[PDB]
Amino acid sequence: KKVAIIGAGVSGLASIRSCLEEGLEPTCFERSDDIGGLWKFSDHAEEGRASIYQSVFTNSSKEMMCFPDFPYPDDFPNFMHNSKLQEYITAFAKEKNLLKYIQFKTLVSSVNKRPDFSVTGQWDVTTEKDGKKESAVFDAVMICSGHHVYPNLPKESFPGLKHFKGKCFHSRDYKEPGIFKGKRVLVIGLGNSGCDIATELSHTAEKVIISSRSGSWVMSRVWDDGYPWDMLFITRFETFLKNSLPTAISDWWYMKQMNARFKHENYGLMPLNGTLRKEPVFNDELPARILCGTVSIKPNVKEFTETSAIFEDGTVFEAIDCVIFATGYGYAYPFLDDSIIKSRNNEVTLFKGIFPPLLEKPTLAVIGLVQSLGATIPTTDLQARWAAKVFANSCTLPTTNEMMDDIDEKMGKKLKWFGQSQTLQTDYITYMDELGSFIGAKPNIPWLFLTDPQLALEVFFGPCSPYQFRLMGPGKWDGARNAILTQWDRTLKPTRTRAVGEAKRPSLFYNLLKILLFPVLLLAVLLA
Amino acid sequence: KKVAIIGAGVSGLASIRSCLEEGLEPTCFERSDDIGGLWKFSDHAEEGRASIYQSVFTNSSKEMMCFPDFPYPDDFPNFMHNSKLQEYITAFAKEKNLLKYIQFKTLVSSVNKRPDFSVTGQWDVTTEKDGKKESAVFDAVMICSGHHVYPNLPKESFPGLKHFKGKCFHSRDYKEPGIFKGKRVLVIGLGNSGCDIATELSHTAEKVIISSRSGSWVMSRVWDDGYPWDMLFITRFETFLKNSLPTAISDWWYMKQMNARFKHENYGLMPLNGTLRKEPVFNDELPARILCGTVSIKPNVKEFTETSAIFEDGTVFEAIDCVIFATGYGYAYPFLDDSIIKSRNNEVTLFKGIFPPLLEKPTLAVIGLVQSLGATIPTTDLQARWAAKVFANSCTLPTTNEMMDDIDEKMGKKLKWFGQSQTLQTDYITYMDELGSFIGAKPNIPWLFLTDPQLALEVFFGPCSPYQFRLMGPGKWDGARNAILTQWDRTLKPTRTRAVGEAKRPSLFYNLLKILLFPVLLLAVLLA
């Protein structure tokens, strides 16, 4: 029953609550004095903790990034300031009575198999508190220590950088644009950090450049008809199509969508390989900032000088005041023997990104080491539900090489779809469904068409909103049906503060992507 | 031959150069020590002068807002910082040798018909210089004193405003957002000033609201396929359609376009009367700022309190720190008898916005008192060409009531199209064509379709770029043809700083707006 939970960020909180709903006895160790982890802004980056800049807004929609049984307030904006999310996370801990189970100011310094591990499956958790080390035995462990904390910072990768006389640092340490007024800034990396920092700087800096290896597709929070992108883009029907179409048709369809608003070619953003379903950039400002000549995109940096950067196409950025490395993150687990997670090819091998296979007893779970178009909060809520049930012997894992087979197959899919077997990227609805099956909470679409087809349609054709994953099966929420059916109400409410039109909600009586298909395939193969 | 020119802004400079090309002897009086007028930023609003805030970017494209014979440098951004335009204006004055003819630091204090005006048609121009009045006789006068200087500020229009204890001022005096950090700001007016100031503030203010009577359509610099809006939207063909379609079809087509990117209804921007071809808002940030909950739109203010504003729908904005009136401008001419310009119904009456009819001899011209989707620079270049020719007795006006008839007809059209007979708004290509005819510089589309049909097509179906207005007829430029044919090169060059795609210039072999009409009118009325 005793479960150690490392971290009180979103992953940890999800874990505590899932432990409680399976009658386990959770203890959550948090090295700082607050919950929310990454989402609580602070002026200075702390070691071992993620570090966000002040102007971060969610890039997932509110109706897509709530705990499935706890919607965001009706009046909340669809995309929220970091502080607004912190407020919600805090609300959720309070509501679900999770604070009891958290020991703050306690670092977990090591986690070690018990000497009798093959028969008990217990763990020795060591925790440094006031400078005072301690130790205790737990039946299971949940690692919720995050993967946006240890910067990926290839210093040793750029010829000449040693010589550069200006200030130079990583996305992690960017906070406010104040001190950059009329400065010359180069940003390395066309990620969401890179683009946010570049566009923000572009309002006050003298000149700003983003250097990109591979380019990137760029989407926006404001999508078709001003609806949040993810409520339109992440759909069981849309996933059905991209899953079960000739991959040349599907690859075509994807690139059409991504390149519809503006021609990436003309803006210097066109990805080297546009078929890759890599996580896109979500950034509303960037095209305008580029067209107004406040940001330009260049290829990778070839060489630095004392004062300059020269790019792979020959051009030069003179008199650079500052270089920002917006080059992403790795991940670590300093408190754990490398052999547990990296149990093969010196490479992270986890069943469904969660359970290390080879483990004699399934009593360690990694929560939140998974990236999709979908949001962390709903993803981790599901991960935790499953891990909690595995710990309570209510579910059991498949066999050891059943799991390794799955891992091998997934690494192959990952290379195909993302160009990396080692990425954390996965297809959201697919992943959510796999885990859904394991705990019997995958919504039965057909059973719905047959009883309550209104809901069935909104579930399949509409947003793959978190509510759906606590609709039926154990741990379901009674609010779920109502929540799904009122999701567009909550989306349209806050934005319509001057009522002149009639509010326009999306129609299912629509098929916007089936008029130039099944009708034109109905006058073509109705003639020949 | 002696012509007095009041002001050395864009209108004045256009006037000086047109005077020179008709052999007149221009004298330009400029109250300040520099040219460019409104476009040269300064920290503090000067009396009698326009006043711009620091972050103003052009909302017209470079290939649409150059003097027709002087394109912007190849590398210039399609939309430019105010300082960049100042640089171009300065380049133009230098190149065309206009500085000789400007007396700086000289205010024009009055302009008076000579006592022998009915025979000579001359003018007494009085100018204060060093506190030192002088006076001189001129054959003609060109008024180029602008119409974005005297703020429209309805103080006694808002019940309770006298009592409001917070700071309160007009768009004119907004400059930097620094001092508004975490302040609560209400902005009155959903014009381009209002929206710029609101969105800028929304990055650092605590809360920002825009109050709008009537709402507004909102376009963006980044239009279809990332091309500048005006290069796509302002087209002879497009004007042909909206001119000669049943006005209910055309009104439908206009609203479809404006409401395509996002549903104004849902964002609180929907205009009270969406058929009105009022100048739209050009603003790239606003939808995202609204969707992120940093800006919300409310109806008109009903009542102010000591500390609050209450809106027509009952809601309230508590603890307002600052109210910004972004409520536009009127216009004046303090140096001129009211009877000259307002020569009827105590209402501005000018033939083609330029010549006061009733004037015994046509020796006074107002330059730049005209607004369209088109840009001031090309518009005033044409106005000045005509006025200069009228002054040199190379052209002559129609009869006095021929002109009044035209004014009456125009005021009717204005009420129909804009809901105001008194607006400065007019249809760009129509106006440019009328003036074109008068000086024999209206491009002969048919003659082109017959000789050089490549050019003919780009002139008619492509952007109504300034080049086209000095293509044929007197005062033409030989660079014009080449300029028109390379306009997309100059648009795409600066923005494509990382070459991965193939650059995508637009096709005429396209008709993007002819596939759901001439085909559906080809299976429907191809059956019945």
Ligand SMILES: Cc1cc2nc3c(=O)[nH]c(=O)nc-3n(C[C@H](O)[C@H](O)[C@H](O)COP(=O)(O)OP(=O)(O)OC[C@H]3O[C@@H](n4cnc5c(N)ncnc54)[C@H](O)[C@@H]3O)c2cc1C
């Ligand atoms: C700039 C940025 C924006 C993002 N925006 C979005 C978005 O809009 N939508 C979205 O879904 N996701 C977003 N993400 C992804 C984000 O990572 C997740 O939403 C989520 O916050 C990660 O939560 P976590 O609990 O797994 O990690 P963290 O928040 O990093 O949680 C780790 C916690 O454990 C503690 N801890 C670490 N090590 C130890 C130890 N050894 N002992 C004890 N305690 C420890 C830390 O103090 C922290 O409290 C964003 C990430 C970044 C960087």
Ligand SMILES: Cc1cc2nc3c(=O)[nH]c(=O)nc-3n(C[C@H](O)[C@H](O)[C@H](O)COP(=O)(O)OP(=O)(O)OC[C@H]3O[C@@H](n4cnc5c(N)ncnc54)[C@H](O)[C@@H]3O)c2cc1C
């Ligand atoms: C914020 C803003 C953005 C704009 N953006 C655009 C745009 O992108 N594109 C566009 O086409 N238009 C734009 N406009 C419209 C703009 O008005 C024109 O581009 C143009 O600047 C107008 O020039 P002007 O010569 O008529 O008047 P002004 O620029 O006001 O110049 C008038 C000159 O007359 C002088 N003057 C006035 N009275 C006297 C006197 N008695 N004696 C001597 N001198 C006098 C003043 O010192 C000044 O130098 C914008 C306007 C604003 C406010």
Ligand SMILES: NC(=O)c1ccc[n+]([C@@H]2O[C@H](COP(=O)([O-])OP(=O)(O)OC[C@H]3O[C@@H](n4cnc5c(N)ncnc54)[C@H](OP(=O)(O)O)[C@@H]3O)[C@@H](O)[C@H]2O)c1
């Ligand atoms: N909510 C928000 O608005 C928001 C804001 C910021 C971040 N986030 C989230 O946090 C996560 C991390 O984003 P991030 O920008 O910090 O990291 P990221 O998504 O991993 O981006 C890293 C960027 O730098 C490039 N890069 C990596 N190593 C490089 C090297 N050695 N040389 C040159 N370029 C290199 C990568 O390009 P390749 O693809 O070519 O490697 C990529 O463009 C994302 O999921 C993001 O969505 C969210």
Ligand SMILES: NC(=O)c1ccc[n+]([C@@H]2O[C@H](COP(=O)([O-])OP(=O)(O)OC[C@H]3O[C@@H](n4cnc5c(N)ncnc54)[C@H](OP(=O)(O)O)[C@@H]3O)[C@@H](O)[C@H]2O)c1
């Ligand atoms: N290049 C740029 O980016 C840029 C930036 C700013 C301005 N400009 C240009 O400068 C010009 C002026 O723009 P602007 O915003 O200053 O002024 P404006 O275009 O005249 O707009 C004024 C706004 O305030 C409203 N208003 C006027 N009187 C009011 C009252 N008594 N109560 C409530 N509302 C009232 C108007 O309402 P109605 O709509 O109901 O009349 C309108 O929404 C335009 O040509 C504009 O394009 C350009």
